[PDB]
Each structure stands twice: as C-alpha cells, then as structure tokens.
Design a protein around this ligand. Structure first.
Ligand SMILES: CN1CCN(C(=O)c2ccc(Nc3ncc4c(n3)-c3ccc(Cl)cc3C(c3c(F)cccc3F)=NC4)cc2)CC1
Length: 268
C-alpha cells in the first residue's frame, strides 16, 4: 500500500524549462507544501521518438539510488497521455549555465565538484550502475551549491548548438567506445577527466572544427592545457584521460589525489 501519486496531489507553478518531450515545472505537494520539480512527458512524443525504453530503464535504476549528489526521483505516475516524474528541485540550476556565466571555474570549485562526482559515481558502481552521464548540462546545483547528477538527460535538448553526438556525445566519448572495444565502469573515469578539463578551461579537451578531427583527437588522446592550468590539475586530468581503461585510477585515488585534497576541503 505504497503511495499512489496523482496530479491532484500537486500545485503546479512556473515552468523551469522545456524538454524534448514535454516540460518541467516548479511544483508543491499540496498537503506538505514541499517544493519539487514536476517533469511532464507526453506519451505521444515518447512514442514518436522511440524513447519509452530509455525511460523505464532509468526510472527503474533511479527509483533505487539515494545519494546526496544524485538528483532524487521521489516517484512517478501516468495517465492515458502523460508520464509524470516527481524530481528533486535544484534551486541553483545547471552547472552548464553557471560555466557559461563564468567561462571557467577556479580550482576550489572544480576540485569540490570532482569530489562530489567521485563520491556519487563510487556509490553508483557499488550498485552496479555504470556509464553515468556527467556532462555539465546534466548536472544541477542544490541550495548549498552542491552538485547533483541529473536523471533523464536524453529528455532535455543539448546545449545551444555546441555538442555533437554519435553513440552518445562526441566530446565525452572514450576511446574504447570509438575503437569498438569492450567498455566497463572505467568509462566513468574518462568522463571525469573530460569534465575536470571542461570545468577548468571552459571547453572540452578534444574540441575541434570538424567532427572527424574530434574523433582522431580522442583516439590519439591529443589534448593540451592552457598555460594557467596548474600542475596538480594537469596530473589528475592526465591520469584520468588514459587511452587504456585499466590504467585509469580508482575513484578512491581521485578522492585522495593531492590536488583534490589541497583544493576540495569541504567535509564529506
Ligand atoms: C529564478 N530563476 C533562476 C534561473 N533559473 C534556472 O536557471 C533554474 C533552472 C532549473 C532549476 N532547477 C531544476 N531542478 C530540477 C530539475 C530541473 N531544474 C529541470 C528543469 C528543466 C528541465 Cl527541461 C529539466 C530539468 C531536469 C534535468 C533533467 F531531467 C535532465 C538533464 C538536465 C536537467 F536539468 N531536472 C529536474 C532551478 C533554476 C530559473 C529560475
């Protein structure tokens, strides 16, 4: 006799954004006045796009994860024409918007994000959840500025025009996935390397003018740092962006890396 959710349970307020397949609203649960983000998906659009499967998979995985740096799915329900996801509201919005605003983050902000991300991924891997999307546009910020990995990235339009895709997003694809090799939890360490670089620099490390060059840069691991990137950061990013997934660090080594601990001092 779990909770049967119904639309009637919520007061809906201002739109927070348009998705590919519907909209997200600021909402309150009526009795409690608790604030949350209500995501509405239109079944006819889900069907047209062939994405129901993505939605059942994530809802299943997501309903079972509880971690302060993973955006919580509190529940879901549907009617004849709509699916509703009752999601944690992150008041500070996306990390991507904040990176656009600032162009790049400092070392403390970056290293603190990486700690949060490493903790969340390490929790995911302990539940056999692998290959999480941690692109900036899929990271939200709580009221204390804590990072939250968002659910259901495929339901939101990719940035502006900047990101190109293939079997996923080109800029974040690891070499093992583009040389058709087997892939495992070690993809998440590659992602973390790309993200750390993007945080510090303001663009991802293999960004190129064509789509085939971006691909060659990844497979060859051709990246360089702007002069302002400090040696501890270069060291971490270089350890994360190893061509061979096996030589990528464990998440615990990321968490105890001296650059991370010098710059991420917030008690976990
Ligand atoms: C006062 N202003 C300040 C500026 N604002 C924001 O930028 C902003 C945007 C969103 C939020 N918070 C928030 N929290 C949770 C979620 C969303 N958005 C939200 C809003 C719109 C859309 Cl389209 C998606 C999502 C996603 C979400 C997702 F499901 C996948 C990937 C990325 C996401 F943000 N998850 C749920 C807060 C501020 C608007 C309000």
């Amino acid at each position: 006799a779990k909770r049967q959710w119904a639309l009637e349970d919520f007061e809906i307020g201002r739109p927070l954004g348009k998705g590919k397949f519907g909209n997200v609203y600021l909402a309150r649960e009526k009795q409690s006045k608790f604030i949350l983000a209500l995501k509405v998906l239109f079944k006819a659009q889900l069907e047209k796009a062939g994405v129901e499967h993505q939605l059942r998979r994530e809802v299943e995985i997501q309903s079972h994860l509880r971690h302060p740096n993973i955006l919580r799915l509190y529940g879901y329900f549907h009617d004849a024409t709509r699916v509703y996801l009752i999601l944690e509201y992150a008041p500070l919005g996306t990390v991507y918007r904040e990176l656009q605003k600032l162009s790049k983050f400092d070392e403390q902000r970056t290293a603190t994000y990486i700690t949060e991300l490493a903790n969340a991924l390490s929790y995911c891997h302990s539940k056999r959840v692998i290959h999480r999307d941690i692109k900036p546009e899929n990271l939200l910020l709580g009221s204390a500025g804590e990072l939250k990995i968002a659910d259901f990235g495929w339901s939101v339009h990719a940035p502006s025009s900047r990101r190109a895709a293939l079997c996923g997003t080109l800029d974040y694809l690891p070499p093992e996935m583009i040389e058709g090799r087997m892939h495992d939890e070690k993809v998440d360490l590659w992602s973390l390397g790309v993200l750390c670089y993007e945080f510090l620099v303001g663009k991802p490390p293999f960004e190129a003018n064509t789509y085939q060059e971006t691909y060659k840069r990844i497979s060859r691991v051709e990246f360089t740092f702007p002069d302002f990137v400090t040696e501890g950061a270069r060291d971490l990013i270089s350890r994360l962006l190893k061509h061979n997934p096996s030589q990528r660090p464990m998440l615990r080594e990321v968490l105890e890396h001296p650059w991370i601990t010098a710059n991420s001092s917030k008690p976990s």
